[PDB]
């Protein structure tokens, strides 16, 4: 909860892609400010979103700017926190994470470099390949 | 309003009502609009739909603190639908809410007839434990006893006993020409079919009320005595006792061939009868023993 993103101004300086920003502004900000519009239509608010690169760049910047624009609460997690050396209990630390996500809600959570922690276990091998699957 | 509407035109607005309920919140004007179609639904003659759209109104309640006083005047439209067909009890609790409009009044004639309208449905409602404590809330009021017919009304309820039904018609048959207030009798006797159904209702209520004391006082009775007691033929008594036995409100066995009829006494062959009776009676003087003990103990210490 100690992550610091400058801007504000930095949010105005990123430029492209405009319409992508106009998608994320909505999917992120609208469900919080106007939950009433969703319950009328019957549409469920999207609970997740995927932003990938680098065909171009600007992923982390843009989302990080939303943290400082929407204000409210923001939570940043580095992908290096999943291993925990022996006893991969950090898996249950995800349950802790979602515990306080249910307390401090609303909140925004970032997941960067998910390919290391969300791989496909295609070739069964070594050891820690499996713990990540857990 | 152009074509004055019909079954189809009133149905076009129906599907459009709920479109803006979840679209936006409007305090007053919308409510006034959402009650506009049911008053046309009475002219549609279809009641099963009128009760659905009226079921959308109750979730909007409580509407008080806004208007105040107009929406309290709409209940006069709702009681019309509820009083119509199947329920006399549904108007019971709601007429105490239509009684809150003369509370702000500032009006005498409307209020004075509001009291009779709220007091006379007790007979039209089937007896229930909720009715018992319902009538006690209205009893004892300072404004209520102003009506002399209210003393007759109350007399039939308090401690029961018996009365001639024709002498009852002497008091309640004058109220048609009497008035001042003719509105309660305008609802009862306004429609010949309505008035007749409430005549048989009053009869059913008085004969049912004569029964519940007989149920506590018997023991047994001759059949022919109940006929002269209820001022009707024995065949009519057979009909009455058939409905009372299928309502299983009171168990009885009434033998027509031998003339011996009775309500209860419950069988209770051995166990529970002697158990409760004998034992609790014996415990009376036992638990009262220590009670009068301290009575003499204090009296003797007052003078010594």
């Amino acid at each position: 909860m100690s992550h610091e993103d400058p801007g504000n101004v930095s949010y105005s300086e990123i430029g492209g892609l405009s319409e992508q920003i106009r998608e994320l502004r909505e999917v992120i900000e609208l469900p919080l400010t106007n939950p009433e519009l969703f319950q009328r239509v019957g549409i469920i608010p999207p609970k997740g979103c995927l932003l990938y690169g680098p065909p171009g760049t600007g992923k982390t910047l843009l989302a990080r700017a939303v943290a400082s624009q929407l204000d409210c609460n923001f939570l940043k997690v580095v992908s290096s926190s999943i291993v925990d050396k022996y006893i991969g209990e950090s898996a249950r630390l995800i349950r802790e994470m979602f515990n306080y996500a249910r307390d401090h809600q609303p909140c925004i959570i970032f997941m960067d470099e998910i390919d290391a922690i969300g791989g496909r276990r295609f070739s069964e091998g070594t050891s820690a390949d499996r713990e990540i699957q857990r | 309003k152009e074509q004055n509407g019909d079954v189809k035109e009133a149905a076009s607005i129906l599907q459009e009502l709920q479109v803006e309920t979840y679209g936006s919140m409007e305090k007053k004007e919308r409510v006034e609009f959402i009650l506009e179609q049911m008053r046309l639904c009475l002219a549609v003659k279809d009641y099963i739909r009128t009760q659905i759209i009226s079921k959308k109104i109750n979730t909007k309640f409580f509407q008080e603190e806004n208007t105040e006083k107009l929406k309290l005047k709409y209940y006069n439209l709702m009681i019309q639908l509820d009083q119509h067909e199947g329920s006399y009890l549904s108007i019971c609790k709601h007429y105490r809410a239509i009684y809150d409009t003369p509370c702000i009044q500032a009006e005498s004639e409307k209020w004075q007839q509001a009291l009779k309208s709220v007091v006379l449905y007790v007979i039209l409602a089937p007896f229930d434990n909720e009715q018992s404590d319902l009538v006690h809330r209205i009893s004892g009021d300072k404004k209520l006893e102003e009506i002399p017919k209210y003393k007759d009304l109350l007399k039939l309820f308090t401690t029961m006993e018996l009365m001639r039904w024709s002498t009852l018609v002497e008091d309640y048959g004058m109220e048609l020409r009497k008035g001042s207030l003719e509105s309660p009798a305008t609802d009862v006797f306004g429609s010949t079919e309505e008035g007749e159904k409430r005549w048989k209702d009053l009869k059913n209520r008085v004969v049912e009320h004569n029964i519940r004391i007989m149920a506590k006082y018997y023991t047994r009775i001759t059949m022919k005595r109940m006929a002269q007691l209820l001022d009707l033929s024995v065949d009519e008594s057979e009909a009455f006792l058939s409905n009372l036995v299928v309502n299983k409100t009171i168990f009885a066995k009434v033998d027509r061939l031998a003339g011996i009829i009775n309500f209860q006494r419950p069988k209770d062959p051995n166990n529970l009868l002697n158990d409760w009776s004998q034992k609790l009676n014996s415990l009376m003087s036992l638990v009262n023993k220590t009670t009068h003990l301290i009575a003499k103990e204090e009296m003797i210490h007052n003078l010594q």
Binding site: - | L241, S242, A252, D255, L257
Partner: protein, 159 residues
């Protein structure tokens, strides 16, 4: 549907007989109306065969039965209502106007004779319940029937 008819002539299982007609109606729904309107008659009648008229009104009150409501569903509701009210006179009064729908019953003798044998004691439980000692001649006037077969049926009720 045929599974239902054969089970109705077999009379062995009155439960699954309603299940077969229910599924058959699920097949006939949304495509062919004439088969869907005639499918409800058998399911509701087999529920009357089970002596459970209370659930009939609950099935016809759903939004699915309102589109298919018609002159036949009132003939089903009136048999459910006469069995609930336990009155043969109302049943016979409605039996003449709905006889056009009564002829579609493949076997009119089975359901009517079993229902008559049933409604017999459903009319007896009203006259018997109020008092234990009862004369046969005056109580037979309510049901309007000779005393012979009546005593035969009562003794059967003891058996």
């Amino acid at each position: 549907m045929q599974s239902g008819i054969i089970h109705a002539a077999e009379e062995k299982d009155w439960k699954t007989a309603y299940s077969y007609f229910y599924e058959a109606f699920e097949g006939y729904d949304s495509i062919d109306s004439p088969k869907a309107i005639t499918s409800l008659k058998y399911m509701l009648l087999c529920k009357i065969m089970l002596n459970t008229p209370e659930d009939v009104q609950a099935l016809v009150s759903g939004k699915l039965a309102l589109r298919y409501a018609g002159r036949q569903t009132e003939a089903l509701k009136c048999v459910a209502q006469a069995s609930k009210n336990r009155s043969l006179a109302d049943f016979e009064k409605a039996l003449t106007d709905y006889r056009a729908e009564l002829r579609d019953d493949p076997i009119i003798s089975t359901h009517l004779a079993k229902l008559y044998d049933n409604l017999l004691e459903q009319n007896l439980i009203r006259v018997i319940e109020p008092f234990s000692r009862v004369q046969i001649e005056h109580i037979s006037s309510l049901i309007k029937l000779s005393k012979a077969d009546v005593e035969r049926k009562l003794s059967q009720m003891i058996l």
